[PDB]
Structure 1
């Protein structure tokens, strides 16, 4: 209802906002926010215009600091860069799912047998004999896991957050099976082919709850 053309000025405005909030280039909200200054168009309509009609023209973006604020030079001027900052939601590389599954198995093996996988070597000081990891199978174990496990892990592999790593463990690793993934990962790695991350394991809903990513007129 009442379609409108994107003017030269409106397009230039969109590009400018994206250049000024580059961490948010693939969001939906940013384009919704631009619709405040661009009354004729919707969030959906602005985002599409950019993505399809304008991105091939971006050329540069403006550089931003650690604190997510635009960086300025000595005399107030903004810094042009052909470097895109990281997005808000980072994806899981197979190497990350393996690094997670191993650390969980390590923690578990130490929680269970009270032995150091690698050294092994008792954590208390009874004399087994316990399985020589990777001989161990997680098999139905799902905890307990300390918030400290996730905190130090996220400290070590900062690409993802503590909450990010936990939910990857809960919804992805526990769904696929800790042993199942480690075996799969190693199977591939041996066969000179790069393995793939865990996918499609999300099993969740809702009544109302409108479809996300639809910033329309109504």
Structure 2
């Protein structure tokens, strides 16, 4: 083991203010390790998180793409506000938005009608299966790429792929109907609905070292 000097501590902080988006990463602290000999990505990251995060004070403002802003006179801008990190959490409002969107697509496909309307004649206005009562049941697609592109176009918080993998690994897991039924129920019971969690079923990949462990056992960059 090796002790952290104030020289190193203040150098960790100067990297983080210069790479704000990466504050919660593992790779960023693995990058500093290459500049502070005797210290690992793990140690550097725990050190920041535990004893140094509280001394952030300011960060430098960056762009969306997502480093780094300068004024007209080529100087850095000190900011007291964090920019988005790399990954965005899924919310209950987002999970419900997607369910409804898919329950709507599924409705548009199965009946060729589209709510809150009629047809996309005949045939008695209001006869339309509709909609609140319509249950997706066993249905899991087809969904064109058009869907998740348009959906992410309208709802920017998450990307096309981000959205599809939620629908895939979470929505289809819990059930399109079950989440609509759940979310609406919590609201009814004056409770605040929670995004669905703990549904990551993936077959065992032994081998493939645990991620988020940048140790002295590489480290060892040789670059």
Question: Shift in Å at residue 76 of structure 1?
Answer: 1.9
- Whole-angstrom distance in 2 between the partners of 1:91 and 1:124: 47
Q: CA deviation at 1:129?
A: 4.6
Superposition deviation, residue 67 in structure 1: 2.5
Looking at structure 1, the residues matched to 130 and 72 of structure 2 have their Cα atoms a distance apart, in angstroms, of: 60
Q: Is the 8 A contact 2:118 2:128 kept in 1?
A: no
Alpha-carbon spacing, 1:128–1:71, altered in 2? closer, same or farther (3 Å)? closer
What whole-Å deviation, never above 9, does each CA across 1:154-178 have from its counterpart, x for those lacking one?
Answer: 0111000000000000000000011
Question: Structure 1: where are the runs of 5+ without partners?
Answer: none
Query: Where does the alignment leave 5 or more consecutive residues of structure 2 unmatched?
Result: 217-223
In 1, the alpha carbon distance for the partners of 2:90 and 2:50 equals 26
**Residues 108, 123 of structure 1: alpha-carbon distance in 2 compared, 3 angstrom cutoff:** farther
Cα-to-partner distance string for 1:155-211 (whole Å, 9 max, x where unaligned): 111000000000000000000011110011101112222110001110014131000
Give the 3 Å change call, closer, same or farther, for CA 13–124 of structure 1 in structure 2: farther
Name the Cα RMSD after superposition. 2.0
- Listed one character per residue, the Cα deviations across residues 107-162 of structure 1 (whole Å, up to 9, x for unaligned) are 00001101112112349999995421111000010000011100010011100000
Task: Decide whether aligned partners of structure 1 residues 204 and 123 sit closer, same or farther in structure 2, where only a CA change above 3 A counts.
Answer: farther
Deviation at 1:66, TM superposition (A): 2.4
Distance 1:125 1:31, change over 3 A: farther
Hey, what's the Cα distance between the residues in 1 that align with 2:38 and 2:160? 42
TM-score (norm 1): 0.94
How many pairs are equivalent? 215
Structure 1 runs, 4 residues or longer, greater than 6 Å off: 123-128
Given that residues 115 and 123 in structure 1 are in contact (C-alpha distance below 8 angstroms), is that contact kept between their aligned partners in structure 2?
A: no
| SS at structure 2 position matched to 1:47 | helix
* CA–CA distance in structure 2, aligned partners of residues 40 and 211 of structure 1: 23
